[PDB]
């Protein structure tokens, strides 16, 4: 009859890493769509050029192969547009499509949470999406707040999210033995998205 911490709980309880370490895990300005750029004045942030009928992605500098890793995404609600997707990808995932689409999750190389739809996509050409968080009823949606956490456990092979301080449950399973990078895909002109790495265990 007492309180036990998860490895996730313990990670969140340690003090977050220095800026130097945040920069090492930040958006890769040499691994991106041609229609986005990392801001020189704030390197935790990328900015999307106003290109019509285009979906654009960018990977984090570090592809995680082991350990638990948690980063914070800030994406202002008003700059999300029709297709705002957050997740992970292999080095082989496409970082651009024509049209407005769920680019992250539309193939075998990416796993994404569509923030507007509250739905998960992976291998979208061949497999159905899933409601997430899974407690949501078919037609029930909530607005994901501006900032939230992404939790990639390469030892369990899982991706999870934390929203408003609450664990949203496991989103994706089956990720052991991969090399997976933070990723987002976006369609909004002049949208800015921040990724701040918090900490890792192992």
């Amino acid at each position: 009859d007492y309180c036990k911490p998860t490895r996730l709980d313990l990670l969140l309880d340690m003090p977050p890493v220095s800026y130097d370490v945040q920069l090492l895990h930040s958006w890769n300005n040499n691994d991106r769509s041609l229609n986005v750029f990392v801001k020189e004045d704030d390197k935790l942030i990328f900015h999307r050029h106003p290109v019509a009928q285009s979906t654009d992605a960018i990977r984090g500098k570090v592809g995680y192969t082991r350990g638990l890793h948690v980063w914070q995404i800030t994406w202002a609600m008003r700059q999300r547009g029709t297709h705002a997707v957050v997740g992970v990808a292999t080095a082989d995932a496409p970082l651009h499509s024509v049209g407005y689409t769920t680019l992250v999750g539309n193939n075998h190389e990416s796993w994404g949470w569509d923030l507007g739809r509250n739905r998960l996509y992976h291998d979208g050409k061949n497999q159905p999406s899933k409601t997430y968080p899974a407690f949501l009823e078919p037609d029930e949606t909530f607005i994901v707040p501006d900032s939230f956490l992404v939790a990639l456990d390469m030892d369990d092979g899982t991706l999870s999210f934390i929203v408003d301080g609450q664990y949203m449950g496991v989103a994706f399973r089956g990720l052991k033995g991969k090399k997976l990078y933070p990723v987002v895909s976006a369609v909004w002109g002049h949208c800015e998205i921040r990724m701040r790495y918090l900490n890792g265990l192992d």
């Binding site: 106003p50 290109v51 019509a52 009928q53 285009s54 700059q79 547009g81 029709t82 407005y100 369609v187 909004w188 002109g189 002049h190 949208c191």
Partner: peptide
Amino acid sequence: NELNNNLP
């Protein structure tokens, strides 16, 4: 006033 705030 394009759907996703982009330039035609």
